[PDB]
């Protein structure tokens, strides 16, 4: 009495920002999103819910996972399980294809894979847009890694009008790369869940950030359409920029800036500067990624390794979909 | 045919920030502003109407200061000389004492000193309040250098109505510090007059900022009467982040902070969680300052001697207000 699945599915990097939820508990966010799912970092998954199991049990990259690191995973399994009336413990086991002590994000790429994986076990036979909807409610920024390339996530009104879709570009996303710059010496941060409530509860800067997301969404529709990279690239730095200020309203206010990510925003700046179009945008935490067109990538790499060793520039390009597979 | 006077006057630190100009000719705020007068840092200047001087001279430190340096004095002269119906050229020699390579800003006690110089030298003979109003019109922070301790810039609604007085404090003033940290890893920065307009003109966020000013302001002189530093600390240090919070709104947006200015911020922080109550704040550039009770300054300094040559820590205490000396 057992029933398997496994999943694939790559991350994704927002250029203009899904930050704040306007319900929390169906994670319906206060303004949609954009994002560029990519090739290099990825999660395999498989889950098996068996009638024997006598816990849920959470294997990361081979390590059992204590409670509060299985926390989103739990509850997605909870949902899951009421949304199929499913009364059997699970065991996840995934791996995240990430360089080593990178620190990326990983809740994307995980809980986007949970998700394809339990639809898979459980006979779900979801749609995309279903698959979509089912990974939201267990992390935002998963829904978008349903889908390749760029994707956008409708903020919608109701669990059922919440959800991504692939945005088609006529291929210039495969034009495009991003470049990771790997950042340690970051505090100890506030989770992106827990910043972004408190930005939306305490922050004075929050409506500013509200009142700017559809101008800068649209432009980024207008930019995809013409391949205006500058374009593109001016829009979405300013939404990070505008992202990571409302942080500094909140009550108490707080930054996911480290030393190093400003060195790294500095040196984007310089090489504008030097003529290599490049833009950088940050999520909840210290890296620094950098937006750039293929052809200028390795100009790129080589003037910062002036200041950063080769291990912490790590390049990635545009990725697909997610992708299920039977046990 | 000459006329010559002279003044000194002590720098201050805003703990409530000025920060946009609601009249740029005459130099209105948006906002009131609060700030305490120092003691280590000064500057001293003379000035001299001529007859027989063929153009107006800026020597500063003893160096000649070319047009884009000597801007804030010229044109504050024009506006002192129109005001005493005086046709002179002058000649304006000025020693700014503050640390070597510092990096401080000296527009309040430079533009506050060349003021109460040129009360003498012409014979305006002006009270604290009109030589408050007179010094705002060179740079706005420096009306409050005119006042010793804790000052006030009340924002008027005119030239009339806006200018600087003391707080009394019944000496609370004389029990605290500030230590600076001076951060020299920064970026060329916008002055503080280009900042602040383009974030009044352009940025999201500067509507946030207005809407709690008077609130920081009200709680500091409820700190102010009961003597409640931990109060007093917290308020400023938010006021000071949420100034910072505007640039990264702005179109373009910019930041004031170096990857020093990240970690010096860090570390106050870390200080506080080990027991020491201090409380940081920055103006128009990378320098952190941190705002200590005296009894508490000497474990501050050491605590912070773990990343910072003792070079870069100065410590300074309540100052007076402006003297003035006739030649
Ligand atoms: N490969 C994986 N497979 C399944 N779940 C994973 C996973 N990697 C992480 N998770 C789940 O996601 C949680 C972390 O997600 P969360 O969003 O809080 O952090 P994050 O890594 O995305 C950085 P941030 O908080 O800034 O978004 C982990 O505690 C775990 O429950
Ligand atoms: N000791 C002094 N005496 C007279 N004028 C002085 C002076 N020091 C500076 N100034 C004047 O003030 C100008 C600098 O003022 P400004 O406000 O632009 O810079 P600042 O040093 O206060 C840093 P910020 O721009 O961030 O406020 C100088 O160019 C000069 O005209
Ligand atoms: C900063 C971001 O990466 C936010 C990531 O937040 P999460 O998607 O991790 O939060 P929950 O929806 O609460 O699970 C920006 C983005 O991905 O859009
Ligand atoms: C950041 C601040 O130091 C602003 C200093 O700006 P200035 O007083 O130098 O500007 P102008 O009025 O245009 O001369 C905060 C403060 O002193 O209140
Ligand atoms: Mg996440
Ligand atoms: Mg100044």
New binding site residues.
């Given amino acids: 009495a057992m029933l398997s699945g496994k999943a694939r599915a790559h991350t994704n990097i927002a250029l203009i920002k899904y930050w704040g939820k306007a319900n929390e508990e169906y994670i319906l966010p206060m303004n949609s999103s954009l994002s560029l799912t990519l090739d290099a970092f990825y999660?395999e998954?498989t889950v098996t819910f068996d009638a024997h199991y006598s816990e849920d049990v959470?294997i990361?990259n081979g390590i059992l996972?204590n409670e509060?690191?299985?926390?989103?995973?739990?509850e997605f399994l909870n949902l899951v399980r009421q949304q199929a009336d499913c009364t059997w413990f699970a065991k996840?086991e995934?791996?995240?294809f990430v360089p080593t002590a990178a620190g990326?994000?990983?809740?994307?790429?995980?809980?986007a894979?949970?998700a394809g994986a339990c639809n898979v076990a459980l006979g779900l036979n979801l749609s995309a847009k279903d698959l979509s909807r089912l990974a939201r409610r267990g992390?935002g920024?998963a829904c978008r890694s349903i889908f390749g390339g760029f994707a956008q996530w409708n903020k919608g009104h109701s669990d059922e009008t919440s959800f991504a879709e692939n945005i088609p570009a006529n291929n210039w996303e495969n034009e495009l790369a991003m470049l990771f710059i790997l950042i340690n010496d970051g505090e100890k941060?506030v989770?992106?869940?827990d910043g972004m409530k408190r930005t939306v509860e305490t922050s004075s800067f929050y409506q500013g950030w509200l009142d700017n997301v559809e101008k800068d969404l649209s432009q980024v529709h207008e930019a995809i359409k013409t391949k205006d990279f500058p374009r593109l690239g001016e829009i979405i730095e300013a939404n990070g920029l505008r992202m990571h200020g409302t942080t500094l309203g909140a009550v108490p206010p707080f930054t996911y800036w480290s030393p190093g990510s400003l060195q790294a925003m500095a040196l984007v700046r310089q090489a504008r500067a030097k003529g290599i179009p490049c833009y950088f945008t940050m999520?909840?935490?210290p890296n620094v990624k950098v937006l750039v067109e293929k052809k200028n990538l390795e100009a790129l790499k080589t003037f910062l390794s002036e200041h950063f060793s080769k291990e912490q520039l790590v390049p990635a390009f545009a990725g697909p979909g997610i992708e299920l597979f039977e046990t």
């Fill in positions: 999660t998954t959470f990361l996972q509060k690191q299985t926390k989103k995973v739990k996840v995934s791996q995240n990326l994000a990983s809740s994307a790429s995980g809980l894979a949970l992390s920024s941060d989770s992106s869940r999520d909840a935490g």
